[PDB]
């Protein structure tokens, strides 16, 4: 692990609860859509924070309007663990804030291919 | 507590290699990834697992479980996005 360059993963967002404590991460797929996990248990009261590097710049605290939790998600098996969040106010896209592409249903990321993961290591489960 | 945004390059691992690590908990809607030693631990719950598909970063997985502690060397389990895209497309339109 290592420190990312400031504004290098511009789709990376933090999910803070009403109290302002980072509980989960997220990915901007559009100006008003964020994708995250279902086990996070995201609420309408939670907020999405974009343009963040140092958790401790031009950040955007965005409000959540609609929460689309996958209806096939059970906490026992933890299958279909995904949630899509429609933002109330859209994110102002800039140098440090922008979206990530989503793959097709037919696309494949096979074993051995080097991918990247980012965040502040805060796990819910 | 990492104050700054962390990153880590990790490989995808096969279902068979992930199944021997866990067992019946792994299913077709879960992508595994991690050649461990502090790599999958950087991602938050619901964080991105991004892969370069034709010169552009694509969301392959979403952090689900397995990446709880950096000390454990088992593969990290992510939500296979491609398998969940049919559900995703239904609400985005």
């Amino acid at each position: 692990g290592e420190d990312a360059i400031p504004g290098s993963w511009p789709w990376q967002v933090s999910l803070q609860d009403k109290t302002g404590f980072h509980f989960c991460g997220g990915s901007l797929i559009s100006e008003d859509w964020v994708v995250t996990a279902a086990h996070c248990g995201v609420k309408t009261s939670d907020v999405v924070v974009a343009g963040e590097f140092d958790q401790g710049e031009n950040i955007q605290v965005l409000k959540i309007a609609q929460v689309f939790k996958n209806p096939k998600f059970n906490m026992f098996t933890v299958r279909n663990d995904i949630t899509l969040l429609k933002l109330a106010t859209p994110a102002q896209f800039s140098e440090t804030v922008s979206a990530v592409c989503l793959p097709n249903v037919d696309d494949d990321f096979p074993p051995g291919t080097v991918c990247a993961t980012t965040g502040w290591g805060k796990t819910k489960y | 507590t990492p104050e700054k945004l962390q990153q880590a390059a990790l490989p995808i691992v096969s279902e068979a290699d992930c199944k021997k690590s866990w067992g019946s908990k792994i299913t077709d809607v879960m992508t595994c990834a991690g050649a461990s030693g502090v790599d999958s631990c950087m991602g938050d719950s619901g964080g991105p697992l991004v892969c370069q598909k034709d010169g552009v970063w694509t969301l392959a997985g979403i952090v689900s479980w397995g990446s709880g502690v950096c000390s454990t060397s088992t593969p990290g389990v992510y939500s296979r996005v491609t398998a969940l895209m049919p559900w995703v497309q239904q609400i985005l339109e």
């Binding site: 360059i5 993963w9 922008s98 990530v100 | 880590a8 552009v56 970063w57």
Partner: peptide, 12 residues
Amino acid sequence: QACGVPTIQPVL
């Protein structure tokens, strides 16, 4: 309006 193409490139 770009997707997966940051204006600041990631250096792993």
